């Protein structure tokens, strides 16, 4: 950091070395993943923090230590029925291998007759989504702070040949220091070439996903453009009542900016929300540096962000250990475990 501030570009070799070491650490865990590191009876289930099509996330309390965790519970039969086996195996294998300050930590994983379990560190601050909708919109410095963390996170993830594919305020939690932690790796994939799966969230899909083209990591950079827009405007650049209408707007290319957007913000967004892949920022010869060197990020100290030395725009209210006040209420359902093993072969490596 000190060098980067003193002489811009001098940190180049150091960043390269950092990523090289981070890749070595990742690959060791990637090649030999951890398995069966806890069991269900070691936790007390308290409250649901969020729900999905084939599972849910619960606040649990580790009986022996007293620590609180967010436990993702996935129904094996539902995963198979929805054809999500490989994606779930992707999620767990990647999560147990990664290590970055802006990614939620996988603490334990295990399975039983009925379910798959991923025990994550509990982030009590709630989703960015909740705060964003309530406040309406973030100021540009506020949005910039969050955006910078995503830029670094994608720099880290893309260096490991990982594509994230589900960026949205719903998947971004705010910690006790006011910093972002990325959650939900359900669509994350380790891929060197191109890939074809239609997945993500309608508002955040790049046009090449929509048009069944085959795509690469450039889709995460498009998604970043959508995120920054939504944070600063209070609404997405492409919205409608139904997904078809959203997809039509994305493929037209036309984006309108609120009058309060700065010239620098509009310029960055034009380069991120770019249909032409040979012109989209993050996908050019200089890669992520085109984004980091952009005028909108001129005030951003990139290393200081990584070191978490920058004062956050807001810190969420903390009421005590195991407080769920920053999370919405959900319908509670009893976690049932069958006496017969379901889908054993499909989930052998979990």
């Amino acid at each position: 950091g000190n060098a980067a501030a003193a002489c811009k570009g001098s940190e180049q070799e150091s960043v390269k070395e950092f990523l090289a070491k981070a890749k070595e650490d990742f690959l060791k865990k990637w090649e030999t993943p951890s398995q069966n590191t806890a069991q269900l009876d070691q936790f007390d289930r308290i409250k649901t923090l969020g729900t999905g099509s084939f599972g849910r996330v619960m606040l649990v309390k580790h009986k022996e230590s007293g620590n609180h965790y967010a436990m993702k519970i996935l129904d094996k039969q539902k995963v198979v029925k929805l054809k999500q086996i490989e994606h779930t195996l992707n999620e767990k294998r990647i999560l147990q291998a990664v290590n970055f300050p802006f990614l939620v930590k996988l603490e334990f994983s295990f399975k039983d007759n009925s379910n798959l379990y991923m025990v994550m560190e509990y982030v009590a601050g709630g989703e960015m989504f909740s705060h964003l909708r309530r406040i309406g919109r973030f100021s540009e410095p506020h949005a910039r702070f969050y955006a910078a963390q995503i830029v670094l996170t994608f720099e880290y993830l893309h260096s490991l040949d990982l594509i994230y594919r589900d960026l949205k305020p719903e998947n971004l939690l705010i910690d006790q220091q006011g910093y972002i932690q990325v959650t939900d790796f359900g669509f994350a994939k380790r891929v060197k070439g191109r890939t074809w799966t239609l997945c993500g969230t309608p508002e955040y899909l790049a046009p090449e996903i929509i048009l069944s083209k085959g795509y690469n990591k450039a889709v995460d950079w498009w998604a970043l453009g959508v995120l920054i827009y939504e944070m600063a405007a209070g609404y997405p650049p492409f919205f409608a009542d139904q997904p078809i209408q959203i997809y039509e707007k994305i493929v037209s290319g036309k984006v309108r900016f609120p009058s309060h957007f700065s010239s620098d913000l509009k310029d960055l967004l034009r380069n991120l929300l770019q249909v032409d892949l040979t012109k989209r920022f993050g996908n050019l010869k200089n890669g992520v540096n085109d984004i980091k060197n952009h005028k909108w990020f001129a005030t951003t100290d990139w290393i200081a962000i990584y070191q978490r030395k920058v004062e956050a725009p807001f810190i969420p209210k903390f009421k005590g250990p195991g407080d769920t006040s920053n999370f919405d209420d959900y319908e509670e359902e009893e976690i049932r475990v069958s006496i017969n093993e379901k889908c054993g072969k499909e989930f052998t490596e979990f």
Partner: peptide, 20 residues
Amino acid sequence: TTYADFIASGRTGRRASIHD
């Protein structure tokens, strides 16, 4: 306003992830 149009839309709540 665009804001009013967004608030009146059916997609201001949590948006589910999609796949086929």
